Amino acid sequence: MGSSQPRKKIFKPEELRQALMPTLEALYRQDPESLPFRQPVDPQLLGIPDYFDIVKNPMDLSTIKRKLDTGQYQEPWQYVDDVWLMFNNAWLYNRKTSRVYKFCSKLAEVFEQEIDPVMQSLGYCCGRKYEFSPQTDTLDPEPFVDCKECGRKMHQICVLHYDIIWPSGFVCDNCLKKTGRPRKENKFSAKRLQTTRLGNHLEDRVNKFLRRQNHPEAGEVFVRVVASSDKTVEVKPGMKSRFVDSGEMSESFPYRTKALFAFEEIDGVDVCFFGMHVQEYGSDCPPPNTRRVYISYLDSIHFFRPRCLRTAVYHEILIGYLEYVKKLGYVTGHIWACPPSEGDDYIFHCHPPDQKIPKPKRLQEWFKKMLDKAFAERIINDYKDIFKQANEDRLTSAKELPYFEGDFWPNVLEESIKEKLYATMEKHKEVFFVIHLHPPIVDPDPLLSCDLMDGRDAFLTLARDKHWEFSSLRRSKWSTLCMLVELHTQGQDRFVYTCNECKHHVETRWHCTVCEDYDLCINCSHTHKMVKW
Numbered sequence: 412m413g414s415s416q417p418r419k420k421i422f423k424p425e426e427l428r429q430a431l432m433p434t435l436e437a438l439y440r441q442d443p444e445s446l447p448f449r450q451p452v453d454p455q456l457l458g459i460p461d462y463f464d465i466v467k468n469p470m471d472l473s474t475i476k477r478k479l480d481t482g483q484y485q486e487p488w489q490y491v492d493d494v495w496l497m498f499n500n501a502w503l504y505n506r507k508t509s510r511v512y513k514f515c516s517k518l519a520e521v522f523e524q525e526i527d528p529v530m531q532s533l534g535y536c537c538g539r540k541y542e543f544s545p546q547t548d549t550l551d552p553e554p555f556v557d558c559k560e561c562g563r564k565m566h567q568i569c570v571l572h573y574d575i576i577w578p579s580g581f582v583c584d585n586c587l588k589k590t591g592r593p594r595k596e597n598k599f600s601a602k603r604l605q606t607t608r609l610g611n612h613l614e615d616r617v618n619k620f621l622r623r624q625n626h627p628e629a630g631e632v633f634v635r636v637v638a639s640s641d642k643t644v645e646v647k648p649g650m651k652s653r654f655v656d657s658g659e660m661s662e663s664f665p666y667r668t669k670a671l672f673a674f675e676e677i678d679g680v681d682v683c684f685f686g687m688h689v690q691e692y693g694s695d696c697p698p699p700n701t702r703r704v705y706i707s708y709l710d711s712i713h714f715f716r717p718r719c720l721r722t723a724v725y726h727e728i729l730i731g732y733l734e735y736v737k738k739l740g741y742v743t744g745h746i747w748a749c750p751p752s753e754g755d756d757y758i759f760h761c762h763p764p765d766q767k768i769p770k771p772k773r774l775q776e777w778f779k780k781m782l783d784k785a786f787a788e789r790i791i792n793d794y795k796d797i798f799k800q801a802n803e804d805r806l807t808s809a810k811e812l813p814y815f816e817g818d819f820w821p822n823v824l825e826e827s828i829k830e831k832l833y834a835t836m837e838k839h840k841e842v843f844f845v846i847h848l849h850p851p852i853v854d855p856d857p858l859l860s861c862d863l864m865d866g867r868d869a870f871l872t873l874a875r876d877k878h879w880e881f882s883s884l885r886r887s888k889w890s891t892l893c894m895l896v897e898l899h900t901q902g903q904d905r906f907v908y909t910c911n912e913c914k915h916h917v918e919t920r921w922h923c924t925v926c927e928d929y930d931l932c933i934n935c936s937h938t939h940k941m942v943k944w
């Protein structure tokens with residue numbers, strides 16, 4: 412059951428006691444906070460028989476000091492794991508509203524700010540014990556990665572190492588200095604994802620907005636449409652009997668669904684902070700969906716830096732989408748303002764616990780605000796709620812309402828099987844918007860095949876199993892890194908190239924470095940720099 416480590420860094424018991432003792436001394440200094448921790452818990456003194464059956468592996472300050480003094484810690488993580496054990500035992504056993512629970516939380520705060528620089532001085536990422544957020548009484552621990560030259564154990568999420576990107580294995584920054592050469596480039600970046608004219612439009616509008624703000628904390632934003640496919644919304648049986656038998660309305664409605672994401676560079680790395688799924692009903696779509704766009708899903712992670720420009724950037728993305736679909740030929744936008752059902756997430760797997768879920772009222776206000784800005788910029792000609800709109804156009808039948816995939820209305824019309832509807836439209840106050848944007852529509856962007864981003868479910872399921880949470884800036888940095896690999900490899904397979912001015916399938920091609928997509932034949936008729944691929 413062997414293995415070889417050629418230059419394994421190891422610590423002498425004096426190095427470890429010298430570096431780790433100041434952090435233990437800092438815990439002991441907390442008075443009277445450290446007092447119920449300076450010795451083992453005696454359930455005979457406290458009257459708690461329950462204790463040892465709850466706390467399987469007891470731990471206290473005296474035991475850690477004894478272990479340190481006798482040299483029982485061989486590696487620094489051994490020490491930090493025992494300090495975190497003592498904290499977790501106290502948090503597990505005691506009530507959140509108890510003296511010793513609060514004492515524990517204070518000691519943990521001190522340990523966090525003391526052990527981080529200490530572990531960092533020993534060549535480590537940090538000194539935290541990390542466990543992943545609950546699922547479906549046991550938690551999954553965060554992954555580790557040992558260095559190929561050093562042999563030291565570090566948090567994979569801390570170091571942002573992924574074998575797929577760096578297949579030669581993990582080497583810590585300190586060993587890379589000793590080599591002399593830098594860590595190789597992450598070519599699975601958000602910037603390197605397939606560029607689309609729609610994504611380009613939202614990226615340019617959201618980047619020119621940030622240039623006007625002069626914020627130093629703000630980093631370059633990338634908007635990429637990661638999946639684009641052609642689907643149809645089938646008409647549900649009750650409505651089918653009422654309108655498709657007569658021929659008054661279609662059996663299915665053809666739409667193109669698009670999934671786009673927003674990424675911001677934070678601390679030199681990509682961080683995904685926004686995601687949106689839309690449905691687009693074209694020129695050849697029969698009524699009642701002709702020339703309409705519908706935001707099916709919308710989700711965000713609150714790590715956009717700077718925090719103040721967050722909602723303002725979100726509005727620029729939405730307004731940019733309404734602007735791009737207007738110039739293509741779409742005439743009506745539609746928004747269903749419905750905040751997420753309690754725990755459940757729309758697009759991003761694990762939300763930050765400190766990220767607030769807007770109340771339906773607040774969310775209705777949020778969309779109203781962006782639409783006011785869109786109206787002021789002469790992008791949107793008008794916007795009204797679903798009730799007010801049905802009277803202005805004098806709608807008399809159910810076949811007149813736009814019928815979207817996964818929308819509330821197809822289900823409302825359907826549950827009138829047992830059966831009042833016009834009252835239900837008024838019932839849902841400002842939760843249904845109608846946006847007025849004003850020659851067939853011709854989408855210049857090619858269909859991007861990506862099963863992960865074909866439906867909200869595929870990405871949510873994969874991130875749930877792979878633990879790609881979006882609950883902290885460090886975990887979101889990791890999840891973005893892994894998500895980008897999945898998109899890059901599930902999009903690498905789809906690469907059929909044709910000549911832009913001849914249409915024949917070409918293998919060797921000249922690509923323009925200035926254009927978005929410019930691949931011509933072997934012969935060359937152009938201005939900007941072309942490159943042989």
Ligand SMILES: CC(=O)SCCNC(=O)CCNC(=O)[C@H](O)C(C)(C)COP(=O)(O)OP(=O)(O)OC[C@H]1O[C@@H](n2cnc3c(N)ncnc32)[C@H](O)[C@@H]1OP(=O)(O)O
Pocket residue numbers: 706707708709710711712721722725747748749750751757767768769770773774777
């Ligand atoms: C079916 C559909 O398509 S519905 C689409 C809507 N999608 C969602 O609701 C998904 C989850 N929501 C989100 O990701 C975001 O809240 C967004 C993108 C909708 C809005 O982005 P933001 O403007 O950053 O969010 P929001 O308006 O909620 O937050 C603004 C402030 O209100 C606060 N706030 C939000 N919800 C609440 C609440 N329930 N109680 C009190 N305050 C709240 C936030 O803490 C924040 O405070 P701060 O900015 O001073 O720190």
Ligand SMILES: [Zn+2]
Pocket residue numbers: 536537538539565566569
């Ligand atoms: Zn770490």
Ligand SMILES: [Zn+2]
Pocket residue numbers: 558559560561562563582583585586
């Ligand atoms: Zn190393």
Ligand SMILES: [Zn+2]
Pocket residue numbers: 923925926929937938939
């Ligand atoms: Zn060109």
Ligand SMILES: [Zn+2]
Pocket residue numbers: 910911912913914931932933
């Ligand atoms: Zn050609």
